[PDB]
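Methods: holo model generation. Sequences were used as deposited, without trimming of termini or removal of tags, and paired with ligand SMILES retrieved from the corresponding compound records. Each pair was processed once, and we did not select among multiple samples. The sequence and 2-acetamido-2-deoxy-beta-D-glucopyranose SMILES for this entry were:
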Amino acid sequence: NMKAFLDELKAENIKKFLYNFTQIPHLAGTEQNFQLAKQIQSQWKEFGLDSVELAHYDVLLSYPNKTHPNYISIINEDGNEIFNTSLFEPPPPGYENVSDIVPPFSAFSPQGMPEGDLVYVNYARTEDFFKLERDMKINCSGKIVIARYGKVFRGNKVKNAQLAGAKGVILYSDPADYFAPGVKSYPDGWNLPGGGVQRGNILNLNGAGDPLTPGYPANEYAYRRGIAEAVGLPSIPVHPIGYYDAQKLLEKMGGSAPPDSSWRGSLKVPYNVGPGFTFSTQKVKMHIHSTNEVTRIYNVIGTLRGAVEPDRYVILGGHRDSWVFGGIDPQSGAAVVHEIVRSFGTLKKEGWRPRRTILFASWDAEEFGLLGSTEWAEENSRLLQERGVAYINADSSIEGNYTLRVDCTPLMYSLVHNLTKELKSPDEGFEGKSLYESWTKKSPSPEFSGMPRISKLGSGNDFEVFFQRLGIASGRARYTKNFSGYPLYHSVYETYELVEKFYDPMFKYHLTVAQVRGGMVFELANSIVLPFDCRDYAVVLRKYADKIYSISMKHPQEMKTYSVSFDSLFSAVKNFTEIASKFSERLQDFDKSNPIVLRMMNDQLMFLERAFIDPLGLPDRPFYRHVIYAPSSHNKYAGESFPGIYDALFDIESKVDPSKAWGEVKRQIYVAAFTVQAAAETLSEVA
Amino acid sequence: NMKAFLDELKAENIKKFLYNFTQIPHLAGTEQNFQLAKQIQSQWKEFGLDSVELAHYDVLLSYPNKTHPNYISIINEDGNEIFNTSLFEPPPPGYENVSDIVPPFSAFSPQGMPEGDLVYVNYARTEDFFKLERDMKINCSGKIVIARYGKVFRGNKVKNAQLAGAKGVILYSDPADYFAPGVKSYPDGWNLPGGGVQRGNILNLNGAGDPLTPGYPANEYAYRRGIAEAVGLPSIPVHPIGYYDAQKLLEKMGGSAPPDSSWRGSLKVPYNVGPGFTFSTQKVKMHIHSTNEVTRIYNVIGTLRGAVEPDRYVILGGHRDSWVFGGIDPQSGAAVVHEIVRSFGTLKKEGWRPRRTILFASWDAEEFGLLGSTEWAEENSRLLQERGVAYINADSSIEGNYTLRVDCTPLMYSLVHNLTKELKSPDEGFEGKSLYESWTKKSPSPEFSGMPRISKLGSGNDFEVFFQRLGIASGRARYTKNFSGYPLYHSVYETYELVEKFYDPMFKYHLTVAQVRGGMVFELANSIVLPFDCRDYAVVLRKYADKIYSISMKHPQEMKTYSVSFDSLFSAVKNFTEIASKFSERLQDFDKSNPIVLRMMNDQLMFLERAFIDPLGLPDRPFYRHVIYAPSSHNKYAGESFPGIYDALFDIESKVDPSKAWGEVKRQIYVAAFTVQAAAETLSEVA
Ligand SMILES: *[C@@H]1O[C@H](CO)[C@@H](O[C@@H]2O[C@H](CO)[C@@H](O[C@@H]3O[C@H](CO)[C@@H](O)[C@H](O[C@H]4O[C@H](CO)[C@@H](O)[C@H](O)[C@@H]4O)[C@@H]3O)[C@H](O)[C@H]2NC(C)=O)[C@H](O)[C@H]1NC(C)=O
Ligand SMILES: *[C@@H]1O[C@H](CO)[C@@H](O[C@@H]2O[C@H](CO)[C@@H](O[C@@H]3O[C@H](CO)[C@@H](O)[C@H](O[C@H]4O[C@H](CO)[C@@H](O)[C@H](O)[C@@H]4O)[C@@H]3O)[C@H](O)[C@H]2NC(C)=O)[C@H](O)[C@H]1NC(C)=O
Ligand SMILES: *[C@@H]1O[C@H](CO)[C@@H](O[C@@H]2O[C@H](CO)[C@@H](O)[C@H](O)[C@H]2NC(C)=O)[C@H](O)[C@H]1NC(C)=O
Ligand SMILES: *[C@@H]1O[C@H](CO)[C@@H](O[C@@H]2O[C@H](CO)[C@@H](O)[C@H](O)[C@H]2NC(C)=O)[C@H](O)[C@H]1NC(C)=O
Ligand SMILES: *[C@@H]1O[C@H](CO)[C@@H](O[C@@H]2O[C@H](CO)[C@@H](O)[C@H](O)[C@H]2NC(C)=O)[C@H](O)[C@H]1NC(C)=O
Ligand SMILES: *[C@@H]1O[C@H](CO)[C@@H](O[C@@H]2O[C@H](CO)[C@@H](O)[C@H](O)[C@H]2NC(C)=O)[C@H](O)[C@H]1NC(C)=O
Ligand SMILES: *[C@@H]1O[C@H](CO)[C@@H](O[C@@H]2O[C@H](CO)[C@@H](O)[C@H](O)[C@H]2NC(C)=O)[C@H](O)[C@H]1NC(C)=O
Ligand SMILES: *[C@@H]1O[C@H](CO)[C@@H](O[C@@H]2O[C@H](CO)[C@@H](O)[C@H](O)[C@H]2NC(C)=O)[C@H](O)[C@H]1NC(C)=O
Ligand SMILES: *[C@@H]1O[C@H](CO)[C@@H](O)[C@H](O)[C@H]1NC(C)=O
Ligand SMILES: *[C@@H]1O[C@H](CO)[C@@H](O)[C@H](O)[C@H]1NC(C)=O
Ligand SMILES: *[C@@H]1O[C@H](CO)[C@@H](O)[C@H](O)[C@H]1NC(C)=O
Ligand SMILES: *[C@@H]1O[C@H](CO)[C@@H](O)[C@H](O)[C@H]1NC(C)=O
Ligand SMILES: *[C@@H]1O[C@H](CO)[C@@H](O)[C@H](O)[C@H]1NC(C)=O
Ligand SMILES: *[C@@H]1O[C@H](CO)[C@@H](O)[C@H](O)[C@H]1NC(C)=O
Ligand SMILES: N[C@@H](Cn1oc(=O)[nH]c1=O)C(=O)O
Ligand SMILES: N[C@@H](Cn1oc(=O)[nH]c1=O)C(=O)O
Ligand SMILES: [Ca+2]
Ligand SMILES: [Ca+2]
Ligand SMILES: [Cl-]
Ligand SMILES: [Cl-]
Ligand SMILES: [Zn+2]
Ligand SMILES: [Zn+2]
Ligand SMILES: [Zn+2]
Ligand SMILES: [Zn+2]
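and the model returned the structure below.
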């Protein structure tokens, strides 16, 4: 029973694991990581799992040339290099030791050394570029863009700048976004020092996994494409800096005023758009010499076999590779997984077994484009779609200590509300009250009324293949701060210390997340009828149908000129509601003793998410096939609904051929409509 | 029990039905057909099915302009029209009546009226064009091609000629292929008169269904493409003639000798390739004025619910629409379906029910590109792939009276051998012996030894969506003559009389096919463990791996220059064999009393075919996704194995960039390999 499962999870053990997991750096593709993989394997065996496998792949990674450093210079009249950027972050107290920490870099930047005139662009979000080029009419072509971390996935900014003719991109972290007021820098607080630099990859893989083998696993015989047709390589070099060097590049900034205060961080400078320097005169030069190279990577997979339905897969997965020590990202998740596995292996040993099979993966190479988990899905896709019940993700557990944060598919809302109601909040001041209670109090849904917010699912972490390509019901949970991240995210300062001292001394937030996570696994893996409520879907679907409808009405002139009708979507959506009522009625009324009828319904429940998948995929993104959600085309971290239609509606006034554009909005609508209906009828009586 | 099912099927009833089904013409989209649909619906209800539905679609059909006739003229110096082609076939005795029989035409021809010089091209198969243009070096560009029915799907010839710059195509049926020696023309024998003309469609839909809605159902709201982007429309006009008119166009034929006797039918003429006439002087002119138009069509669907596993679908389907009366194609199949349904509805009434749900479809619009069945699959694709156990096809039952003819997926070979062994042959001279016996004797497998031939599955009839796009195990059976067809195929002479008098007076061949067909349904629908032998697949897979390997060796120079290795395929194939052994072992050993374990294995069996599907599809043909079989790119009627690799190997010497070509052969190999392995591991233990 569940009560048992939970009681067995101990905070102390988590501390133990997190400490063990973050003494040395753990970069994808390095021996340190191969060795940790070898370790997780044994202790998982030891904790009593039936089988623990390594699965390895040979994929494209990316590194800095050790003997020939990346950096930014400023250059005078005859390229005297006046100023240079750091070559590494000042290491935290007690890691001179730190034998080799990769220097900052943007993974997969093309090689290059371009020169030209900074133009500042803010976040390099779509609208900034709109603001720049439609109003200011400042022109990015030929220039070097410097932009600031925060807001949207860094791969989006580099794609944007590229679109806008740029020839280089420099990212920096502005205290504006990474400096909580009144807290002190590491080692003494948790604010990011002006020395540190957010590492991270900049690919736009859009779901393909290893860029050389879209569609198939990158195993021994896998045919690989030319780096020249690689999926999602930028063609302009990119590099990141802390706010000290930043300041030094920002401070001489020419051309216009920031078109407004929304464009200005807390660096003491003009934040001038540009281009040029005021030093007229002086110019910027990047030095990028990283190389890309096929490298081998290692996933850890441990089966805990089902006793009743060994052919139903519940999957708990998180990544193992870090940019540096990774005290928060990923090892605070990893630690939690570990205590979870051990706790299961414990009941198992007491002679207990789950109704369904549970799978535990330590993923590899997350930081380089969700490569580790993806190739595995590509290899096992058939077994996953005919058997995958649900996937729970397990990256960082805390990124803040203020409240819970959950994203998931509507089919888990009910289970998540029930489960959080059966758990103690560990918030200062809700000792005594439930986790549903604190969470609801602190974080209340827009969608109303007495309801904790739960978010959509975009991409940006390892659940993406499983929900967006395959249609397996997915979800995640972690503790958050009151997209930009936390200040010391993906930097040398993410250390075990960072957690013990400042985030969760008690380890009570870890162990809450360890309960939401293992608790969801547990329910999903063991409960006689699947925890899904097909009705919640019927709810959000009608909200979403409204949202998209409102958007279109921004243009009723056209809507009339072209007979743009949402009746089909609403019609489809109504039918869904109706069928799910009837369905759940039936779900109430049927002797749980009849196993065949049971299995038949859980199949209806299980394959329901699968019903929102189009084999053709969304336009231009073949590996994004959920019709209801995909990653935002403007920010991959953010999920969007009816992406097919939103994307067609987006920025539509700017299109030359309005009849063709509006035609495609219609096509998109008619695909949504049919897919909602088609899904619905999976819930209808089977004969 | 099965014995009962069979005994209940009566030849007399079949005659009854076939007679009823062929008194008037039954063209897709006409009221006669809507009415027959209305009929099948009631009698199916009456015969005792639980539900019988109409499902309707609005798809692109194609007709001749009634007030403005299609035809071929010859034209002198100042376009005097000297000779014209028939405008209809002389109707058989007793159908002046015949109120309106569509005139011959090729469906979906573009409109046009071009002039130029016949060039004769034989069958318009790929090699003929090779022969013409690589040897003869006779150049088809600018010309009008006349070619002869037979050998390959008529859509292939029109595509070929188009490729070869042609500006028109005339098909004819040459007594060479449609005149069995020593038999007399209809009404007196079954040879095709020189008046009659094979009707038929010429689209290259390559799996898409209704050309306006590839991917989605053509329901009420479905967005439709411009006829200008329609899927698989030819852009040169086509038209068919009997051998009388043929002769008149063939007789003046200029340029070269037929490059050999393989190129010559039994018309008394030179069979001169051309181009030009000898009449120098005179020229050919086509007159095509057909129109394409969205029209509504009607499928009939009848459920017979399962008692144990109502969520497993066994499907028996055949088409209902005819080009004229359709005494053979389709109504000899349809009649058989009818007697089959009635027979089931009979046991049902006696209070019996199948273990699984059986589905019975009368399909619409087969003759126009497999449209009827396809749109239905597109609409229900989700329900079909998570539930479709198998599909048996039911077009024409006899096309000859000499032996059985079966095509199917390897997973049905065993069931088909067992079942035919339990049935009486109805061959003159095997009274006393089994149907396995006569069939084996008359038609012995190349693949050896004491084994009836069974063929691959291409396309060319309604099973195509179900096997080639969806991966549902498919099969078919009918009586055959000792691709070209039978002489009176798709002509006015296909009548009830044609069958009673010449093919099967007794109705004993019908009723054998009615037994193979209903018998397979019965087993598949009712047997406790699915009739599939995953081992037979392990057999043919290794044969196929050999075939393709032999092909490549035609080029060992290259094979060496590029390290072209099949090890991966063989490796994959070996693994398959091994896993299926082990699998079937397990299948022997497991208490059939445990329902959950039962269901789990039948799922492994059921989804196994599904495992050979690639969501990305084969190159250029997105709706052909079986990696093991697709339709031949040179003849859609013919199935080919490892189509992905064969097609890359095909005609490879002619390619400019041999490194790119050979690279793609490799890619193709590595996809086969992985897919065979991936399938295999579905058969592995589930945890
Ligand atoms: C939501 O669920 C409901 C089922 O409860 C479903 O209802 C269906 O609506 C369809 C779509 O319009 C109805 O369509 C009609 O079918 C009849 C035959 O029964 C036809 O005669 C109609 O066609 C005539 O009129 C057309 C429309 O104006 C003309 O274009 C045409 O030329 C004809 O003259 C029409 O096709 C259908 O009957 C029902 N089925 C029912 C009511 O049970 C609805 O479609 C579902 N929504 C979605 C988005 O899938
Ligand atoms: C058919 O089924 C069998 C399983 O019975 C399956 O066997 C596998 O073969 C793979 C493919 O080659 C083996 O691959 C090796 O794995 C080890 C680790 O265990 C590696 O060290 C090897 O890599 C080294 O050598 C490579 C190859 O020459 C070098 O490129 C590389 O740099 C390394 O130094 C290699 O990757 C694997 O061990 C087995 N699994 C087994 C034997 O259980 C076979 O692949 C299946 N066939 C197909 C087509 O899928
Ligand atoms: C982290 O924890 C693990 C597990 O206890 C330690 O691994 C063991 O330590 C020693 C090596 O000094 C060996 O005797 C055991 O083989 C190790 N077990 C393994 C490899 O699973 C690991 O060394 C600890 N590492 C750190 C960095 O604290
Ligand atoms: C920034 O670093 C650069 C690169 O090393 C320095 O310029 C180099 O100085 C070496 C040693 O004198 C020269 O011989 C190389 O020509 C230089 N490289 C280039 C491309 O200029 C430079 O000293 C630095 N500028 C500052 C502010 O220290
Ligand atoms: C969450 O809890 C609610 C109430 O516990 C569950 O819905 C109830 O389940 C019982 C047991 O079947 C039903 O008979 C009641 O009708 C339900 N109450 C309501 C308001 O529906 C729901 O099952 C739970 N969600 C889960 C566990 O997935
Ligand atoms: C073929 O068979 C059917 C079924 O017996 C005949 O349909 C019945 O005939 C008369 C109409 O004259 C009606 O009283 C019944 O309603 C019909 N039943 C139906 C429509 O299912 C049908 O007329 C026969 N047609 C031919 C061409 O022989
Ligand atoms: C072939 O049929 C054509 C088409 O009708 C005949 O030519 C037509 O004759 C009518 C009646 O005299 C003319 O006024 C039209 O100009 C003709 N149409 C064309 C395009 O020529 C012609 O008589 C026929 N040839 C033969 C052998 O009977
Ligand atoms: C076709 O018949 C053969 C023999 O009837 C079947 O294989 C036998 O099935 C029995 C019953 O399980 C097994 O114990 C024997 O080992 C089998 N004999 C052989 C040679 O395998 C096979 O099941 C049948 N194929 C079907 C019905 O799908
Ligand atoms: C690293 O630097 C050297 C020369 O400074 C370069 O030639 C070498 O190939 C580099 N290694 C790579 C590209 O991995
Ligand atoms: C931007 O500037 C460059 C001039 O170097 C030019 O080539 C490009 O067409 C310009 N376009 C815009 C967006 O004004
Ligand atoms: C954890 O403790 C307190 C409670 O609000 C908070 O102020 C502190 O900043 C928290 N940890 C972090 C690093 O946010
Ligand atoms: C049939 O023939 C006439 C004129 O001869 C043509 O204008 C009419 O539109 C045609 N009907 C069609 C194209 O369906
Ligand atoms: C075939 O003939 C025509 C001349 O009308 C020409 O335009 C085309 O290039 C020729 N090509 C071949 C295949 O010889
Ligand atoms: C049916 O009967 C005999 C047996 O061989 C055959 O010669 C005749 O041609 C058959 N039917 C047809 C039309 O082939
Ligand atoms: N979570 C990582 C990895 N990352 O997430 C993606 O979706 N792509 C990608 O590289 C990051 O945000 O840096
Ligand atoms: N069976 C018919 C229909 N036909 O089969 C296809 O595969 N396409 C198509 O139009 C024929 O052969 O004429
Ligand atoms: Ca891959
Ligand atoms: Ca369609
Ligand atoms: Cl997560
Ligand atoms: Cl058939
Ligand atoms: Zn992470
Ligand atoms: Zn990360
Ligand atoms: Zn047919
Ligand atoms: Zn036909």
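Residues A 200-201, 366-367, 369-370, 459-461, 636 surround QUS (ligand 15) (CB under 6 Å).
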